[PDB]
Amino acid sequence: LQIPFAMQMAYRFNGIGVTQNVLYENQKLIANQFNSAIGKIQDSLSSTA
Amino acid sequence: PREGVFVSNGTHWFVTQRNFYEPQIITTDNTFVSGNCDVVIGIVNNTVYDPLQPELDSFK
Ligand SMILES: *[C@@H]1O[C@H](CO)[C@@H](O[C@@H]2O[C@H](CO)[C@@H](O[C@@H]3O[C@H](CO)[C@@H](O)[C@H](O)[C@@H]3O)[C@H](O)[C@H]2NC(C)=O)[C@H](O)[C@H]1NC(C)=O
Ligand SMILES: *[C@@H]1O[C@H](CO)[C@@H](O[C@@H]2O[C@H](CO)[C@@H](O[C@H]3O[C@H](CO)[C@@H](O)[C@H](O)[C@@H]3O)[C@H](O)[C@H]2NC(C)=O)[C@H](O)[C@H]1NC(C)=O
Ligand SMILES: *[C@@H]1O[C@H](CO)[C@@H](O[C@@H]2O[C@H](CO)[C@@H](O[C@H]3O[C@H](CO)[C@@H](O)[C@H](O)[C@@H]3O)[C@H](O)[C@H]2NC(C)=O)[C@H](O)[C@H]1NC(C)=O
Ligand SMILES: *[C@@H]1O[C@H](CO)[C@@H](O)[C@H](O)[C@H]1NC(C)=O
């Protein structure tokens, strides 16, 4: 069942015990943090063997 | 939404539980307020019915 990804992340925030408004008001920051974390995963894999 | 998700059939808006389509009128009881309109990406305009107002309207 399709759902907008921001809405899914709000569902997951509810799952961990945080209200949806936190995600909907910090969406830009959360997306930037996730993207930076994925980039750091890239760097860690491409450097550490 | 307190619990559930906002949906629209095309003209009107409702709040329903996520796992079963049971549309309901968006009221103050079904929802909670947080902040203003300028910070949420994808917010839409719609009236939020106040269950208390018609009771006081008959009072008036
Ligand atoms: C809660 O935590 C986040 C960090 O995860 C804070 O966001 C960070 O806030 C600082 C200052 O606003 C940002 O630093 C700025 O970076 C820009 C980059 O162009 C730079 O020009 C500024 O001079 C400044 O150094 C930082 O980037 C930002 N981090 C992310 C991932 O966006 C947030 O401010 C904290 N909020 C509260 C209420 O504590
Ligand atoms: C999306 O949901 C809306 C709520 O069900 C719906 O609006 C409703 O449409 C029906 C007509 O099909 C109305 O039903 C009433 O129709 C007459 C109008 O006076 C009454 O006499 C009847 O007894 C019956 O109650 C609803 O009143 C009307 N609800 C509202 C708030 O206007 C939309 O039609 C739905 N949109 C689509 C595309 O399906
Ligand atoms: C959702 O509801 C909002 C409020 O009804 C509405 O924002 C309103 O948008 C109109 C025009 O887009 C603004 O009307 C005036 O805007 C400027 C002032 O900055 C004037 O120069 C114009 O001539 C016009 O008179 C309203 O000021 C503005 N209301 C608020 C509180 O900012 C949104 O457009 C609605 N969103 C959607 C998708 O319909
Ligand atoms: C969703 O997609 C349409 C076009 O694909 C776009 O106009 C709209 O801005 C998008 N919604 C949001 C909240 O960005």
Q: B5 vs A21: CB contact, 8 Å cut-off?
A: no
The experimental resolution of this structure, in angstroms, equals: 2.7
Comparing CB atoms, the residue among A4, A6, A25 nearest residue B35 is: A25
Q: How far apart are CA B1 and CA B40, in angstroms?
A: 14
Method of determination used here: cryo-EM
Tokens representing residue B24 in the block = 């309901």
Could you tell me the end-to-end alpha-carbon distance of chain B, in angstroms, rounded to an integer?
A: 30
A19 in reach of chain B (CB within 8 A): yes
Which are the contacts of A23, defined by CB distance < 8 A and separation ≥ 6?
A6, A9, A10, A13, A30
Q: What is the Å distance from ligand 3's center to B19 Cα?
A: 35
Q: Is the CB of B9 under 6 A from ligand 2?
A: yes
Tokens 């907008």 identify what position? A4
